[PDB]
Amino acid sequence: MFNKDQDYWVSVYSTKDFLSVETDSGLGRVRRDPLFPSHLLPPDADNQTIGDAVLIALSNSRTLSLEESADFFDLETGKEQYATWIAMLMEKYGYKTKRALFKDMKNCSIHCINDLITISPTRHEKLEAWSGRGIKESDDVVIPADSIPEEIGAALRLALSRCKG
C-alpha cells in the first residue's frame, strides 16, 4: 500500500541482456537507492513478473529526512555507488567495455503518487545520459496504482517502445 501524497520513484534500465527495475530515493531530487539491489530480470520477462518487480521497487522508495539527506547526496559516495553499479552490470553480464553495456540501453522513469503510476520514456543522449528532450507529455504511459501487475508490465513495455535516440 502506498501512502497518500507521498512520492515513490523507480528507474528502469533495459538492454538486450537484462531488464533492471530499480528503487530510487531522495528528497525532491532522487537517485538510485544503495540500500536496495536492482531487480535484475530476464530481458524476456513477462508482464506479471515485471509488474510485481515494479510494485516492490516502488514500495521501497524512500522520502528522506533532513539528516538522511546530507549523507545520501554525498558526492564521493555517489561516484563510488554509480561506478559500482556499472561494474556489477559488466561483471554479471560479461560486458567487456562500458560501450558494450550502454550502447543500446533504454531508460524509463516510474512515478507513483496518489493512486497514479506514470511511466516516462527518455531520449538516449550520451553513452551514460538520458533526457526528456523530444519526449512529449503524451508519450507518458499512465495506469492506476492498483492495476494488476500484468497491466503495469504492459505499460512499462509500451514506455520502453517509446524511448528514442
Do 85 and 32 meet the contact criterion of CB atoms below 8 Å apart?
A: yes
Per the entry, the structure determination technique was X-ray
Q: Which grid coordinates are listed for 133?
A: 528532450
Q: How far is CA 37 from CA 27, 51, 78, 138, 155, in A?
A: 20, 17, 15, 31, 23
Q: How far is CA 34 from CA 30, 126, 148, 154, in A?
A: 12, 24, 28, 27
Do 9 and 24 meet the contact criterion of CB atoms below 8 Å apart?
A: yes
Beta strand pairing status for 130-131 and 141-144? Answer: unpaired
Q: 3-class DSSP state for residue 44? A: coil
C-alpha–C-alpha distance, residues 155 and 165, integer Å: 20
CATH architecture of the domain with range 1-165? 3-Layer(aba) Sandwich (3.40)
Do 159 and 121 meet the contact criterion of CB atoms below 8 Å apart?
A: yes
